């Protein structure tokens, strides 16, 4: 039985870079789709395709650099077991001044950056950079 | 580990206990004197070390270090305690500052006087 769906994503991303696949599999869900979206825009994953028509899986395409991976900061800020929310002006910027955290808010799923002056704060789900 | 365990069973931070107790909780102590002995030290470091017990006036029977050279100490002498300890002597957790109260300082000391009280000479 799963306790974190979201881990299933992140775990297999870092693993999978390491494993030298080019796209990895794990069960989708609505939120998960929308997390893979910010990564993708910002560039953190190559692209993504969702086969739901039979049984949902988020087939997310791995981006590589050249041979070196692009994972170095992947960790989940939040947990199911430590659900967290950080306000508009008490949201930390993560790792580096170049950092990127996927952050959910009341509008949508966004990012540290975007979410900020978007008048919002909310759950920082994770970060990749 | 996990938070919810701690929510029940809070983490400690200290136990609130000194390395060296003071047994009066202050800078300085009035203690009497019970026996002017000179024992040989704990650990082999072969010497004669001037110690003395001393019944403090607020209670507690404790043992204090005697330093410098010379003495004036008596079995009903009443001393000012420096506090703090030295290694190589076991039941000593306490030290006597001479040259304070009735007790005299070091006879013929002309450097590092503050340690073991004694006034600077006129010169």
């Amino acid at each position: 039985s799963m306790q974190d769906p979201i881990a299933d994503m992140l775990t297999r991303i870092r693993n999978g870079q390491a494993a030298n696949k080019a796209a990895v599999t794990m069960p989708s869900s609505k939120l998960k789709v929308a997390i893979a979206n910010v990564l993708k825009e910002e560039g953190f994953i190559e692209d993504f395709k969702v086969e739901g028509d039979t049984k949902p899986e988020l087939e997310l395409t791995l981006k590589y650099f050249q041979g070196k991976a692009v994972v170095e900061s992947i960790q989940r800020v939040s947990r199911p077991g430590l659900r967290i929310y950080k306000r508009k002006d008490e949201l930390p910027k993560v790792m580096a001044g170049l950092g990127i955290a996927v952050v959910s808010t009341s509008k949508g799923v966004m990012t540290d950056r975007a979410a900020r002056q978007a008048g919002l704060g909310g759950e920082i789900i994770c970060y990749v950079a | 580990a996990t938070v919810n365990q701690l929510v029940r069973k809070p983490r400690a931070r200290k136990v609130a206990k000194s390395n060296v107790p003071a047994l009066e909780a202050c800078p300085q102590k009035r203690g009497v004197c019970t026996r002017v002995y000179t024992t040989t030290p704990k650990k082999p470091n072969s010497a004669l070390r001037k110690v003395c017990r001393v019944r403090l006036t607020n209670g507690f029977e404790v043992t204090s270090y005697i330093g410098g050279e010379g003495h004036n100490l008596q079995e009903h002498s009443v001393i000012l305690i420096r506090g703090g300890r030295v290694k190589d002597l076991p039941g000593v957790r306490y030290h006597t500052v001479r040259g304070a109260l009735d007790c005299s300082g070091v006879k013929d000391r002309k450097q590092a006087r503050s340690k073991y009280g004694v006034k600077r000479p006129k010169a």
């Binding site: 910002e42 560039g43 953190f44 981006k63 650099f65 692009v70 170095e72 790792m95 580096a96 001044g97 170049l98 950079a129 | -």
Partner: protein
């Protein structure tokens, strides 16, 4: 490409069959003033050539870091050995703020304004393991930028 320094310095021993050697081995660093700076273990049975030989093996090493304006842009979190290594970015008003091995290696690589920390064992021989953990682990403006190049 030079800017001589030494760091640590100490002795080590093997038991010959009953006699003992007491070889003086040690860490150094030679700068370049922009990074590409290493480390060496200069064994010497005597004391002077103990840093001689170290500065040799320094030339036989390098770890390139990219950094600008004396301030490494990327905080350090990295852990190798039981030495935890840290560096929080400080734009200004901090020197090096260090008494570690990680004082000297974070200066010679051109580094005039950083603020630093470590937890773990104080053991200077692997305080130099900040070199995996801040030199080779780095994140540069152009580094992330070529993720975005894609």
């Amino acid at each position: 490409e030079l800017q001589e320094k030494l760091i640590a310095v100490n002795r080590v021993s093997k038991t010959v069959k009953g006699g003992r050697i007491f070889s003086f081995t040690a860490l150094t660093v030679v700068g370049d003033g922009n990074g590409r700076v290493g480390f060496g273990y200069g064994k010497a049975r005597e004391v002077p050539a103990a840093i001689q030989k170290a500065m040799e093996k320094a030339r036989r090493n390098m770890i390139n870091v990219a950094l600008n304006n004396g301030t490494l842009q990327h905080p350090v979190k990295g852990v190798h050995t039981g030495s935890r290594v840290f560096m929080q970015p400080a734009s200004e008003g901090t020197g090096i703020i260090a008494g570690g091995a990680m004082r000297a290696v974070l200066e010679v690589a051109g580094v005039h304004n950083v603020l630093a920390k470590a937890y773990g064992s104080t053991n200077p021989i692997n305080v130099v393991r900040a070199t995996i953990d801040g030199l080779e682990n780095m994140n540069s403006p152009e580094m992330v930028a070529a993720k975005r190049g894609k």
